[PDB]
Protein backbone atom coordinates (compact mmCIF):
# COMPACT_ATOMS: atom_id res chain seq x y z
CA UNK A 1 0.00 0.00 0.00
CA UNK A 2 1.44 3.61 -0.79
CA UNK A 3 0.10 6.70 0.85
CA UNK A 4 -2.65 7.80 -1.15
CA UNK A 5 -0.78 11.61 -1.24
CA UNK A 6 2.49 9.42 -3.38
CA UNK A 7 -0.73 7.74 -5.70
CA UNK A 8 -2.37 11.37 -6.58
CA UNK A 9 1.27 12.78 -6.66
CA UNK A 10 2.49 10.59 -9.32
CA UNK A 11 -0.76 9.27 -11.19
CA UNK A 12 -2.38 12.73 -11.34
CA UNK A 13 0.02 14.24 -14.14
CA UNK A 14 -1.11 11.11 -16.04
CA UNK A 15 -4.82 11.99 -16.12
CA UNK A 16 -3.89 15.64 -16.56
CA UNK A 17 -2.40 14.99 -19.95
CA UNK A 18 -5.72 12.80 -20.75
CA UNK A 19 -8.08 15.82 -19.41
CA UNK A 20 -6.03 18.36 -21.23
CA UNK A 21 -6.71 16.83 -24.55
CA UNK A 22 -9.65 18.92 -26.39
CA UNK A 23 -11.59 18.15 -28.02
CA UNK A 24 -11.14 14.06 -27.69
CA UNK A 25 -11.04 14.42 -23.39
CA UNK A 26 -14.78 15.96 -23.83
CA UNK A 27 -16.90 12.86 -24.32
CA UNK A 28 -14.79 10.93 -20.84
CA UNK A 29 -15.03 14.04 -18.54
CA UNK A 30 -18.44 13.31 -16.88
CA UNK A 31 -20.32 10.05 -16.13
CA UNK A 32 -22.69 9.12 -19.63
CA UNK A 33 -25.73 10.23 -19.01
CA UNK A 34 -28.07 8.13 -21.50
CA UNK A 35 -30.56 9.19 -21.60
CA UNK A 36 -29.80 13.16 -22.27
CA UNK A 37 -27.10 12.16 -24.78
CA UNK A 38 -30.36 10.48 -26.79
CA UNK A 39 -28.86 6.81 -26.56
CA UNK A 40 -31.46 4.47 -24.17
CA UNK A 41 -29.70 1.22 -24.34
CA UNK A 42 -26.35 2.30 -23.43
CA UNK A 43 -26.64 0.38 -19.63
CA UNK A 44 -27.53 -2.61 -21.91
CA UNK A 45 -23.86 -3.16 -23.25
CA UNK A 46 -22.10 -0.74 -21.20
CA UNK A 47 -22.55 -2.82 -17.48
CA UNK A 48 -19.53 -0.91 -15.48
CA UNK A 49 -19.39 2.59 -16.43
CA UNK A 50 -16.54 4.69 -15.96
CA UNK A 51 -15.21 8.24 -16.59
CA UNK A 52 -12.39 10.96 -15.74
CA UNK A 53 -14.72 12.52 -13.32
CA UNK A 54 -15.07 9.31 -11.32
CA UNK A 55 -11.39 8.65 -11.81
CA UNK A 56 -10.43 12.21 -10.45
CA UNK A 57 -12.48 11.57 -7.19
CA UNK A 58 -11.14 7.99 -6.03
CA UNK A 59 -7.64 9.76 -6.90
CA UNK A 60 -8.39 12.91 -4.79
CA UNK A 61 -9.78 10.73 -2.00
CA UNK A 62 -7.59 7.98 -1.67
CA UNK A 63 -9.53 4.61 -2.65
CA UNK A 64 -7.04 3.50 -4.64
CA UNK A 65 -4.47 1.17 -2.37
CA UNK A 66 -2.38 0.34 -5.72
CA UNK A 67 -1.70 1.72 -9.15
CA UNK A 68 -2.75 -1.01 -11.20
CA UNK A 69 -6.35 -0.34 -9.63
CA UNK A 70 -6.12 3.51 -11.47
CA UNK A 71 -4.80 1.40 -15.34
CA UNK A 72 -7.62 -0.89 -14.47
CA UNK A 73 -10.49 1.90 -14.55
CA UNK A 74 -8.94 3.92 -17.31
CA UNK A 75 -9.15 0.96 -19.85
CA UNK A 76 -12.28 0.43 -18.83
CA UNK A 77 -13.49 3.48 -19.84
CA UNK A 78 -11.51 3.22 -22.98
CA UNK A 79 -13.35 -0.07 -23.41
CA UNK A 80 -16.44 0.74 -22.70
CA UNK A 81 -16.17 3.32 -25.19
CA UNK A 82 -14.53 0.68 -27.86
CA UNK A 83 -17.34 -1.67 -26.75
CA UNK A 84 -20.71 0.99 -27.32
CA UNK A 85 -19.56 3.03 -30.06
CA UNK A 86 -18.58 2.06 -33.90
CA UNK A 87 -15.04 1.89 -35.29
CA UNK A 88 -16.03 4.59 -37.73
CA UNK A 89 -17.66 6.77 -34.79
CA UNK A 90 -16.27 10.01 -33.30
CA UNK A 91 -15.94 8.70 -29.84
CA UNK A 92 -14.37 5.76 -30.91
CA UNK A 93 -11.28 7.34 -32.48
CA UNK A 94 -11.10 10.06 -29.97
CA UNK A 95 -11.07 7.33 -27.41
CA UNK A 96 -8.06 5.98 -29.36
CA UNK A 97 -6.45 8.98 -29.35
CA UNK A 98 -6.50 9.05 -25.50
CA UNK A 99 -5.19 5.68 -25.11
CA UNK A 100 -1.96 6.53 -27.22
CA UNK A 101 -1.56 9.45 -25.20
CA UNK A 102 -1.86 7.30 -21.85
CA UNK A 103 0.02 4.38 -22.86
CA UNK A 104 3.33 6.77 -23.68
CA UNK A 105 2.22 8.71 -19.96
CA UNK A 106 1.60 5.48 -17.61
CA UNK A 107 5.09 3.60 -18.81
CA UNK A 108 7.51 5.57 -17.01
CA UNK A 109 5.34 6.65 -13.84
CA UNK A 110 4.48 3.08 -13.51
CA UNK A 111 8.33 2.17 -13.39
CA UNK A 112 9.34 5.27 -11.04
CA UNK A 113 7.20 3.43 -8.48
CA UNK A 114 9.18 0.16 -9.06
CA UNK A 115 7.41 -1.39 -11.49
CA UNK A 116 8.38 -4.01 -14.45
CA UNK A 117 6.57 -1.52 -16.57
CA UNK A 118 3.15 0.44 -17.10
CA UNK A 119 1.52 -1.85 -20.49
CA UNK A 120 -1.28 -3.22 -20.30
CA UNK A 121 -0.55 -6.70 -22.25
CA UNK A 122 -2.90 -9.07 -24.19
CA UNK A 123 -1.87 -12.04 -25.70
CA UNK A 124 -2.29 -12.34 -29.98
CA UNK A 125 -5.94 -14.11 -31.00
CA UNK A 126 -5.98 -17.70 -32.12
CA UNK A 127 -6.75 -18.31 -35.71
CA UNK A 128 -10.54 -20.38 -35.54
CA UNK A 129 -11.08 -22.77 -38.47
CA UNK A 130 -14.02 -24.08 -39.83
CA UNK A 131 -15.57 -27.25 -39.55
CA UNK A 132 -17.53 -26.85 -43.39
CA UNK A 133 -14.84 -26.24 -45.44
CA UNK A 134 -11.02 -27.57 -45.66
CA UNK A 135 -8.68 -24.39 -44.72
CA UNK A 136 -11.92 -21.81 -44.12
CA UNK A 137 -11.21 -19.44 -41.56
CA UNK A 138 -12.65 -16.96 -38.96
CA UNK A 139 -11.29 -13.10 -39.11
CA UNK A 140 -10.68 -11.32 -36.35
CA UNK A 141 -13.75 -8.82 -35.14
CA UNK A 142 -16.27 -10.44 -37.49
CA UNK A 143 -19.20 -12.20 -36.57
CA UNK A 144 -19.49 -16.50 -36.39
CA UNK A 145 -21.52 -18.76 -35.33
CA UNK A 146 -20.00 -21.83 -32.87
CA UNK A 147 -21.39 -24.79 -30.99
CA UNK A 148 -20.07 -26.33 -27.64
CA UNK A 149 -17.00 -23.86 -28.05
CA UNK A 150 -15.70 -26.69 -30.48
CA UNK A 151 -17.90 -26.08 -33.85
CA UNK A 152 -17.50 -22.93 -35.10
CA UNK A 153 -18.71 -21.48 -38.68
CA UNK A 154 -17.83 -18.30 -40.52
CA UNK A 155 -20.85 -16.07 -41.25
CA UNK A 156 -20.81 -17.18 -44.89
CA UNK A 157 -20.66 -20.81 -45.16
CA UNK A 158 -22.96 -21.19 -41.92
CA UNK A 159 -26.04 -19.81 -44.06
CA UNK A 160 -24.61 -21.56 -47.20
CA UNK A 161 -26.53 -24.62 -46.19
CA UNK A 162 -29.68 -25.34 -46.98
CA UNK A 163 -32.36 -25.63 -44.00
CA UNK A 164 -31.85 -25.22 -39.96
CA UNK A 165 -29.82 -28.40 -39.52
CA UNK A 166 -26.09 -28.92 -38.69
CA UNK A 167 -24.08 -31.97 -38.96
CA UNK A 168 -21.14 -32.48 -36.73
CA UNK A 169 -18.80 -35.06 -37.05
CA UNK A 170 -22.84 -38.17 -37.64
CA UNK A 171 -25.34 -35.72 -35.42
CA UNK A 172 -27.68 -33.15 -36.43
CA UNK A 173 -28.04 -29.79 -34.34
CA UNK A 174 -30.43 -27.05 -34.97
CA UNK A 175 -29.08 -23.60 -36.10
CA UNK A 176 -30.75 -21.96 -32.99
CA UNK A 177 -28.38 -23.81 -31.02
CA UNK A 178 -25.01 -22.23 -32.22
CA UNK A 179 -24.13 -19.02 -30.26
CA UNK A 180 -23.73 -15.92 -32.70
CA UNK A 181 -20.43 -14.34 -31.19
CA UNK A 182 -17.37 -11.66 -32.68
CA UNK A 183 -13.90 -13.02 -32.80
CA UNK A 184 -12.96 -10.51 -30.41
CA UNK A 185 -11.79 -11.65 -27.01
CA UNK A 186 -7.82 -11.05 -25.60
CA UNK A 187 -6.56 -12.84 -22.67
CA UNK A 188 -5.02 -10.35 -20.67
CA UNK A 189 -1.13 -11.43 -19.49
CA UNK A 190 -0.55 -12.38 -16.33
CA UNK A 191 0.70 -11.14 -12.57
CA UNK A 192 2.62 -12.59 -10.15
CA UNK A 193 3.41 -10.51 -6.86
CA UNK A 194 6.54 -10.30 -5.06
CA UNK A 195 6.31 -11.58 -1.95
CA UNK A 196 8.88 -8.67 -0.20
CA UNK A 197 7.27 -5.98 -1.05
CA UNK A 198 3.69 -6.94 -2.68
CA UNK A 199 3.99 -5.15 -6.20
CA UNK A 200 2.45 -6.83 -8.75
CA UNK A 201 4.27 -7.80 -12.26
CA UNK A 202 3.97 -8.75 -15.61
CA UNK A 203 5.01 -13.16 -14.78
CA UNK A 204 6.58 -12.70 -18.51
CA UNK A 205 8.44 -9.13 -17.42
CA UNK A 206 10.07 -10.63 -14.57
CA UNK A 207 10.47 -14.56 -16.03
CA UNK A 208 9.31 -16.03 -13.08
CA UNK A 209 8.51 -19.72 -13.27
CA UNK A 210 7.14 -21.79 -10.05
CA UNK A 211 9.12 -24.83 -11.07
CA UNK A 212 12.17 -23.31 -11.38
CA UNK A 213 12.33 -21.06 -8.09
CA UNK A 214 9.88 -22.59 -6.31
CA UNK A 215 10.66 -20.58 -3.02
CA UNK A 216 8.46 -17.40 -4.52
CA UNK A 217 8.62 -14.58 -6.56
CA UNK A 218 10.92 -11.73 -5.30
CA UNK A 219 11.52 -8.33 -8.00
CA UNK A 220 15.32 -7.29 -8.56
CA UNK A 221 14.57 -4.31 -6.49
CA UNK A 222 13.91 -6.12 -3.34
CA UNK A 223 16.87 -8.53 -4.24
CA UNK A 224 19.23 -5.48 -4.82
CA UNK A 225 18.15 -3.58 -1.67
CA UNK A 226 19.16 -6.65 0.40
CA UNK A 227 22.73 -7.92 -2.43
CA UNK A 228 20.71 -10.82 -3.30
CA UNK A 229 20.13 -12.38 -6.73
CA UNK A 230 17.96 -15.05 -7.93
CA UNK A 231 18.88 -18.52 -7.53
CA UNK A 232 20.95 -20.09 -10.59
CA UNK A 233 18.04 -21.53 -13.45
CA UNK A 234 19.15 -25.01 -14.00
CA UNK A 235 16.64 -26.00 -16.47
CA UNK A 236 18.72 -24.27 -19.40
CA UNK A 237 19.15 -25.25 -22.74
CA UNK A 238 23.05 -25.99 -22.07
CA UNK A 239 22.40 -28.72 -19.90
CA UNK A 240 19.90 -30.38 -21.35
CA UNK A 241 22.12 -33.86 -22.61
CA UNK A 242 24.56 -33.73 -25.08
CA UNK A 243 24.44 -35.85 -28.15
CA UNK A 244 27.30 -36.34 -31.26
CA UNK A 245 24.93 -35.08 -33.49
CA UNK A 246 24.09 -31.32 -31.56
CA UNK A 247 27.84 -31.31 -30.14
CA UNK A 248 29.07 -31.88 -34.27
CA UNK A 249 26.83 -29.28 -35.16
CA UNK A 250 27.09 -26.59 -32.13
CA UNK A 251 30.96 -26.46 -32.61
CA UNK A 252 30.32 -25.96 -36.54
CA UNK A 253 28.08 -22.85 -35.26
CA UNK A 254 30.83 -21.63 -32.86
CA UNK A 255 33.95 -21.92 -34.35
CA UNK A 256 32.34 -20.03 -37.35
CA UNK A 257 31.10 -17.21 -34.96
CA UNK A 258 34.60 -17.03 -33.56
CA UNK A 259 36.30 -17.15 -36.94
CA UNK A 260 33.53 -13.94 -37.91
CA UNK A 261 34.77 -11.70 -34.40
CA UNK A 262 31.65 -9.80 -34.98
CA UNK A 263 31.15 -7.52 -31.69
CA UNK A 264 28.56 -8.72 -29.17
CA UNK A 265 28.63 -12.70 -30.48
CA UNK A 266 27.26 -15.06 -28.33
CA UNK A 267 27.74 -18.89 -28.15
CA UNK A 268 25.01 -21.35 -29.28
CA UNK A 269 23.62 -23.82 -28.13
CA UNK A 270 22.43 -27.10 -30.24
CA UNK A 271 20.28 -29.95 -28.82
CA UNK A 272 18.89 -32.88 -30.03
CA UNK A 273 16.01 -33.63 -28.15
CA UNK A 274 14.29 -36.40 -29.88
CA UNK A 275 14.87 -39.48 -31.39
CA UNK A 276 12.62 -42.45 -32.52
CA UNK A 277 11.96 -45.06 -34.96
CA UNK A 278 8.71 -44.79 -36.80
CA UNK A 279 7.35 -45.98 -40.32
CA UNK A 280 6.13 -44.42 -43.19
CA UNK A 281 3.17 -46.47 -44.66
CA UNK A 282 2.63 -46.55 -48.78
CA UNK A 283 -1.04 -44.51 -49.43
CA UNK A 284 -4.30 -46.55 -50.40
CA UNK A 285 -3.70 -45.28 -53.96
CA UNK A 286 -0.08 -46.58 -54.53
CA UNK A 287 -0.42 -49.36 -52.45
CA UNK A 288 -3.31 -51.08 -55.06
CA UNK A 289 -0.88 -49.72 -57.80
CA UNK A 290 2.37 -51.56 -56.87
CA UNK A 291 2.21 -52.77 -53.18
CA UNK A 292 -0.65 -55.57 -53.61
CA UNK A 293 1.88 -57.01 -57.11
CA UNK A 294 4.81 -56.59 -55.05
CA UNK A 295 6.63 -54.16 -57.01
CA UNK A 296 6.95 -51.90 -53.72
CA UNK A 297 7.11 -52.17 -49.69
CA UNK A 298 3.74 -51.39 -47.93
CA UNK A 299 6.19 -49.11 -45.79
CA UNK A 300 9.57 -47.45 -44.52
CA UNK A 301 11.12 -47.37 -41.95
CA UNK A 302 13.09 -44.02 -40.92
CA UNK A 303 14.21 -42.56 -37.86
CA UNK A 304 12.90 -38.91 -36.97
CA UNK A 305 14.82 -36.71 -34.72
CA UNK A 306 14.13 -33.04 -33.43
CA UNK A 307 16.77 -30.17 -33.31
CA UNK A 308 17.09 -26.87 -31.66
CA UNK A 309 19.05 -24.38 -31.30
CA UNK A 310 19.49 -21.62 -28.62
CA UNK A 311 21.44 -18.26 -27.58
CA UNK A 312 21.57 -16.27 -24.44
CA UNK A 313 20.15 -12.67 -25.13
CA UNK A 314 19.94 -10.35 -22.33
CA UNK A 315 20.96 -12.97 -19.92
CA UNK A 316 18.46 -15.43 -20.89
CA UNK A 317 18.39 -18.53 -23.36
CA UNK A 318 16.42 -17.87 -26.48
CA UNK A 319 14.96 -20.98 -28.97
CA UNK A 320 15.72 -18.95 -32.22
CA UNK A 321 15.79 -22.29 -35.06
CA UNK A 322 13.89 -25.62 -35.18
CA UNK A 323 14.08 -28.61 -37.33
CA UNK A 324 12.86 -31.88 -37.61
CA UNK A 325 14.63 -34.61 -39.84
CA UNK A 326 13.65 -38.15 -41.16
CA UNK A 327 16.48 -40.55 -41.64
CA UNK A 328 15.71 -43.71 -43.92
CA UNK A 329 18.83 -45.78 -42.67
CA UNK A 330 20.90 -49.20 -45.02
CA UNK A 331 18.25 -51.27 -43.51
CA UNK A 332 15.32 -50.02 -45.20
CA UNK A 333 13.80 -51.10 -48.54
CA UNK A 334 14.89 -49.44 -51.88
CA UNK A 335 13.97 -46.58 -53.08
CA UNK A 336 14.13 -44.42 -49.36
CA UNK A 337 17.29 -46.53 -48.57
CA UNK A 338 20.51 -44.17 -47.32
CA UNK A 339 18.45 -40.88 -47.58
CA UNK A 340 17.60 -38.11 -45.40
CA UNK A 341 14.28 -36.05 -45.72
CA UNK A 342 13.96 -32.30 -44.16
CA UNK A 343 10.38 -32.39 -42.64
CA UNK A 344 10.39 -29.01 -41.56
CA UNK A 345 12.40 -26.08 -40.65
CA UNK A 346 11.57 -22.72 -38.79
CA UNK A 347 13.33 -19.98 -36.97
CA UNK A 348 12.36 -17.09 -34.58
CA UNK A 349 14.59 -14.01 -35.86
CA UNK A 350 15.97 -12.29 -32.96
CA UNK A 351 19.67 -13.95 -33.28
CA UNK A 352 22.39 -11.69 -32.80
CA UNK A 353 24.15 -10.15 -34.33
CA UNK A 354 21.71 -9.87 -37.36
CA UNK A 355 23.87 -9.69 -39.51
CA UNK A 356 25.06 -13.28 -39.35
CA UNK A 357 21.70 -15.00 -38.76
CA UNK A 358 21.01 -16.73 -42.22
CA UNK A 359 24.98 -17.55 -42.11
CA UNK A 360 24.43 -19.46 -39.20
CA UNK A 361 20.94 -21.35 -40.35
CA UNK A 362 23.34 -22.03 -43.63
CA UNK A 363 25.97 -23.64 -41.00
CA UNK A 364 23.84 -25.93 -39.15
CA UNK A 365 22.04 -26.99 -42.07
CA UNK A 366 25.30 -27.52 -43.79
CA UNK A 367 26.53 -29.22 -40.54
CA UNK A 368 23.83 -31.50 -40.86
CA UNK A 369 24.37 -32.70 -44.44
CA UNK A 370 28.15 -33.31 -43.49
CA UNK A 371 27.16 -35.57 -40.76
CA UNK A 372 24.55 -37.39 -42.69
CA UNK A 373 27.35 -38.12 -45.07
CA UNK A 374 29.64 -39.43 -42.74
CA UNK A 375 27.18 -42.24 -41.26
CA UNK A 376 26.90 -43.24 -44.87
CA UNK A 377 23.32 -41.48 -46.45
CA UNK A 378 23.59 -40.87 -49.46
CA UNK A 379 21.47 -38.28 -50.47
CA UNK A 380 19.38 -35.55 -48.61
CA UNK A 381 15.99 -34.41 -50.14
CA UNK A 382 14.55 -30.75 -49.18
CA UNK A 383 11.04 -29.82 -50.38
CA UNK A 384 11.34 -25.74 -50.36
CA UNK A 385 7.58 -24.69 -49.13
CA UNK A 386 7.05 -21.66 -47.24
CA UNK A 387 3.83 -21.85 -44.65
CA UNK A 388 0.76 -20.76 -45.90
CA UNK A 389 -0.49 -17.57 -44.23
CA UNK A 390 -1.08 -17.83 -40.67
CA UNK A 391 0.02 -21.50 -40.35
CA UNK A 392 3.80 -22.05 -37.92
CA UNK A 393 6.01 -24.73 -38.98
CA UNK A 394 7.56 -25.51 -35.25
CA UNK A 395 7.23 -22.08 -33.04
CA UNK A 396 3.51 -20.61 -32.55
CA UNK A 397 2.84 -17.17 -33.29
CA UNK A 398 6.07 -15.41 -35.16
CA UNK A 399 6.88 -11.83 -34.81
CA UNK A 400 4.34 -9.77 -36.31
CA UNK A 401 7.32 -8.18 -38.56
CA UNK A 402 9.50 -11.37 -39.21
CA UNK A 403 8.61 -11.36 -43.01
CA UNK A 404 7.69 -15.14 -44.70
CA UNK A 405 9.50 -15.65 -47.43
CA UNK A 406 7.86 -16.65 -51.17
CA UNK A 407 8.86 -19.49 -52.93
CA UNK A 408 11.45 -18.17 -55.30
CA UNK A 409 13.24 -16.53 -52.20
CA UNK A 410 13.05 -19.54 -50.58
CA UNK A 411 14.33 -21.54 -53.31
CA UNK A 412 17.18 -19.36 -53.73
CA UNK A 413 17.98 -19.53 -50.04
CA UNK A 414 18.23 -23.05 -50.19
CA UNK A 415 20.26 -22.38 -53.25
CA UNK A 416 22.97 -20.90 -51.70
CA UNK A 417 23.19 -23.03 -48.78
CA UNK A 418 24.05 -25.97 -51.01
CA UNK A 419 26.39 -23.82 -53.36
CA UNK A 420 28.06 -23.46 -50.28
CA UNK A 421 28.41 -27.30 -49.43
CA UNK A 422 29.58 -27.95 -52.45
CA UNK A 423 32.62 -25.52 -52.44
CA UNK A 424 33.47 -27.00 -49.10
CA UNK A 425 33.37 -30.60 -50.51
CA UNK A 426 30.46 -31.74 -48.44
CA UNK A 427 27.43 -32.04 -51.38
CA UNK A 428 29.12 -33.05 -54.16
CA UNK A 429 26.35 -31.83 -56.59
CA UNK A 430 22.77 -31.43 -56.37
CA UNK A 431 19.50 -31.00 -58.88
CA UNK A 432 16.28 -30.67 -59.31
CA UNK A 433 13.63 -33.37 -58.50
CA UNK A 434 12.93 -33.28 -62.69
CA UNK A 435 16.64 -33.19 -63.80
CA UNK A 436 17.23 -35.90 -61.09
CA UNK A 437 14.87 -38.46 -62.62
CA UNK A 438 16.13 -37.59 -65.85
CA UNK A 439 19.89 -38.54 -64.93
CA UNK A 440 18.62 -41.45 -63.27
CA UNK A 441 16.54 -43.06 -65.93
CA UNK A 442 13.73 -42.97 -63.98
CA UNK A 443 10.75 -44.51 -65.64
CA UNK A 444 7.73 -44.91 -62.54
CA UNK A 445 6.36 -43.67 -59.40
CA UNK A 446 7.25 -46.66 -57.61
CA UNK A 447 10.98 -45.50 -58.09
CA UNK A 448 10.58 -42.03 -56.64
CA UNK A 449 11.51 -41.64 -52.25
CA UNK A 450 8.69 -42.05 -50.39
CA UNK A 451 8.07 -39.54 -47.61
CA UNK A 452 6.29 -39.00 -44.62
CA UNK A 453 4.03 -35.92 -45.04
CA UNK A 454 5.77 -35.18 -48.75
CA UNK A 455 4.28 -33.45 -51.67
CA UNK A 456 5.11 -36.83 -54.20
CA UNK A 457 2.96 -39.24 -52.18
CA UNK A 458 -0.53 -36.94 -52.13
CA UNK A 459 -0.04 -35.77 -55.69
CA UNK A 460 0.40 -39.67 -56.56
CA UNK A 461 -2.87 -40.77 -55.47
CA UNK A 462 -4.52 -37.91 -57.23
CA UNK A 463 -3.08 -38.50 -60.68
CA UNK A 464 -3.57 -42.74 -60.31
CA UNK A 465 -7.56 -41.67 -59.46
CA UNK A 466 -7.62 -38.43 -62.46
CA UNK A 467 -6.00 -41.19 -64.72
CA UNK A 468 -8.06 -43.98 -63.38
CA UNK A 469 -5.42 -46.19 -63.06
CA UNK A 470 -1.96 -44.45 -63.68
CA UNK A 471 3.27 -42.32 -64.00
CA UNK A 472 1.80 -41.54 -67.22
CA UNK A 473 2.37 -37.59 -66.66
CA UNK A 474 4.88 -38.35 -64.10
CA UNK A 475 7.70 -36.25 -65.65
CA UNK A 476 5.20 -33.75 -66.56
CA UNK A 477 4.20 -33.07 -62.94
CA UNK A 478 7.72 -33.54 -62.09
CA UNK A 479 9.28 -30.41 -64.49
CA UNK A 480 5.88 -28.43 -63.71
CA UNK A 481 7.41 -28.26 -59.77
CA UNK A 482 10.97 -28.49 -60.05
CA UNK A 483 12.07 -25.37 -58.57
CA UNK A 484 10.55 -26.60 -55.47
CA UNK A 485 12.10 -29.86 -55.11
CA UNK A 486 16.04 -30.48 -54.30
CA UNK A 487 17.93 -34.03 -54.25
CA UNK A 488 21.21 -33.38 -52.57
CA UNK A 489 24.09 -35.67 -53.59
CA UNK A 490 26.37 -36.51 -50.70
CA UNK A 491 28.11 -39.13 -51.90
CA UNK A 492 28.62 -40.70 -55.81
CA UNK A 493 28.66 -42.78 -57.94
CA UNK A 494 30.73 -46.05 -56.97
CA UNK A 495 31.12 -45.36 -53.84
CA UNK A 496 27.51 -45.27 -53.14
CA UNK A 497 27.20 -48.84 -54.05
CA UNK A 498 29.37 -50.63 -51.35
CA UNK A 499 28.95 -49.16 -48.55
CA UNK A 500 29.15 -50.78 -44.78
CA UNK A 501 25.92 -50.46 -42.70
CA UNK A 502 24.66 -46.98 -41.05
CA UNK A 503 25.29 -47.05 -37.62
CA UNK A 504 24.19 -43.92 -35.71
CA UNK A 505 26.31 -44.01 -32.20
CA UNK A 506 23.53 -41.60 -30.83
CA UNK A 507 20.75 -43.16 -29.10
CA UNK A 508 17.29 -43.22 -29.00
CA UNK A 509 15.78 -40.26 -27.21
CA UNK A 510 11.82 -40.36 -26.25
CA UNK A 511 10.21 -37.09 -25.69
CA UNK A 512 6.60 -37.60 -26.97
CA UNK A 513 6.43 -33.39 -26.56
CA UNK A 514 8.82 -33.45 -29.86
CA UNK A 515 7.58 -36.48 -32.00
CA UNK A 516 6.80 -34.16 -34.90
CA UNK A 517 5.97 -30.53 -34.58
CA UNK A 518 1.85 -31.15 -33.69
CA UNK A 519 2.86 -31.41 -30.11
CA UNK A 520 5.03 -28.56 -29.34
CA UNK A 521 2.31 -26.44 -31.16
CA UNK A 522 -0.38 -27.56 -29.30
CA UNK A 523 1.11 -26.72 -25.86
CA UNK A 524 2.14 -23.45 -26.97
CA UNK A 525 -1.24 -22.82 -28.18
CA UNK A 526 -2.72 -24.17 -24.96
CA UNK A 527 -0.18 -22.25 -22.52
CA UNK A 528 -0.15 -18.85 -24.22
CA UNK A 529 3.46 -19.86 -25.54
CA UNK A 530 4.19 -17.46 -28.43
CA UNK A 531 7.49 -16.77 -30.36
CA UNK A 532 6.12 -13.10 -31.05
CA UNK A 533 8.45 -11.15 -29.78
CA UNK A 534 11.51 -11.08 -27.21
CA UNK A 535 10.11 -10.95 -24.00
CA UNK A 536 7.35 -13.88 -25.11
CA UNK A 537 9.69 -15.96 -26.93
CA UNK A 538 12.03 -15.85 -23.72
CA UNK A 539 9.26 -16.92 -21.54
CA UNK A 540 8.23 -19.35 -24.25
CA UNK A 541 11.89 -20.77 -24.52
CA UNK A 542 12.41 -20.48 -20.35
CA UNK A 543 9.14 -22.57 -20.02
CA UNK A 544 9.73 -25.12 -23.03
CA UNK A 545 13.20 -26.35 -21.00
CA UNK A 546 11.23 -26.80 -18.03
CA UNK A 547 9.00 -29.48 -20.02
CA UNK A 548 11.83 -30.64 -21.57
CA UNK A 549 13.94 -31.45 -18.73
CA UNK A 550 10.97 -32.67 -16.17
CA UNK A 551 9.49 -35.28 -18.80
C1 LIG B 1 13.70 -20.15 -43.72
C2 LIG B 1 14.30 -19.10 -42.74
C3 LIG B 1 15.06 -19.78 -41.57
C4 LIG B 1 15.29 -18.19 -43.50
O1 LIG B 1 15.32 -16.88 -42.94
P1 LIG B 1 16.58 -15.93 -43.13
O2 LIG B 1 17.78 -16.60 -43.70
O3 LIG B 1 16.90 -15.24 -41.69
O4 LIG B 1 16.10 -14.70 -44.02
P2 LIG B 1 14.90 -14.77 -45.03
O5 LIG B 1 14.88 -15.88 -46.02
O6 LIG B 1 13.65 -14.74 -44.03
O7 LIG B 1 14.88 -13.33 -45.84
C5 LIG B 1 15.95 -12.37 -45.77
C6 LIG B 1 15.46 -10.90 -45.89
O8 LIG B 1 14.30 -10.81 -46.73
C7 LIG B 1 13.25 -10.13 -45.99
N1 LIG B 1 12.13 -10.85 -46.53
C8 LIG B 1 11.85 -12.14 -46.44
N2 LIG B 1 10.74 -12.35 -47.13
C9 LIG B 1 10.36 -11.20 -47.66
C10 LIG B 1 9.32 -10.89 -48.43
N3 LIG B 1 8.50 -11.87 -48.76
N4 LIG B 1 9.11 -9.64 -48.85
C11 LIG B 1 10.01 -8.62 -48.48
N5 LIG B 1 11.10 -8.98 -47.68
C12 LIG B 1 11.24 -10.26 -47.30
C13 LIG B 1 13.53 -10.37 -44.55
O9 LIG B 1 12.89 -9.33 -43.74
C14 LIG B 1 15.06 -10.28 -44.55
O10 LIG B 1 15.50 -8.89 -44.51
P3 LIG B 1 16.86 -8.43 -43.76
O11 LIG B 1 17.98 -8.28 -44.96
O12 LIG B 1 16.70 -7.25 -42.90
O13 LIG B 1 17.27 -9.67 -42.82
C15 LIG B 1 13.20 -18.20 -42.18
O14 LIG B 1 12.73 -17.46 -43.30
C16 LIG B 1 12.02 -18.95 -41.57
O15 LIG B 1 12.10 -19.54 -40.49
N6 LIG B 1 10.92 -18.80 -42.31
C17 LIG B 1 9.60 -19.37 -41.99
C18 LIG B 1 9.64 -20.89 -42.17
C19 LIG B 1 9.93 -21.34 -43.61
O16 LIG B 1 9.81 -20.58 -44.57
N7 LIG B 1 10.27 -22.65 -43.69
C20 LIG B 1 10.58 -23.28 -44.93
C21 LIG B 1 10.29 -24.74 -44.78
S1 LIG B 1 11.29 -25.55 -46.08
ZN1 LIG C 1 5.41 -5.37 -17.10
ZN1 LIG D 1 -16.13 -21.18 -43.73
ZN1 LIG E 1 9.66 -6.51 -4.17
ZN1 LIG F 1 27.25 -6.46 -38.49
Known amino acids: IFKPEELRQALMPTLEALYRQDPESLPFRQPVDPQLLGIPDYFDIVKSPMDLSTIKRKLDTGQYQEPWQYVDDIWLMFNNAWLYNRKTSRVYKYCSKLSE ?67 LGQTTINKEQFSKRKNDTLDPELFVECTECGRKMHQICVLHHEIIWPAGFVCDGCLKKSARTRKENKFSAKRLPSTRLGTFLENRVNDFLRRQNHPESGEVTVRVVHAS ?53 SDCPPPNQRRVYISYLDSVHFFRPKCLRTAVYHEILIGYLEYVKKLGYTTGHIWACP ?165
Open 101 to 167: VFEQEIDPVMQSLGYCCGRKLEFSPQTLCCYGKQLCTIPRDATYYSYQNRYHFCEKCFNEIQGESVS
Open 277 to 329: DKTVEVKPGMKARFVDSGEMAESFPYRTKALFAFEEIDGVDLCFFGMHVQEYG
Open 387 to 551: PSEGDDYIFHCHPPDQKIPKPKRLQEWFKKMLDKAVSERIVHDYKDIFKQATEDRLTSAKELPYFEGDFWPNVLEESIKESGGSSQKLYATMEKHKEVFFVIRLIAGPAANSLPPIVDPDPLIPCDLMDGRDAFLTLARDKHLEFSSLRRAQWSTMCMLVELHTQ
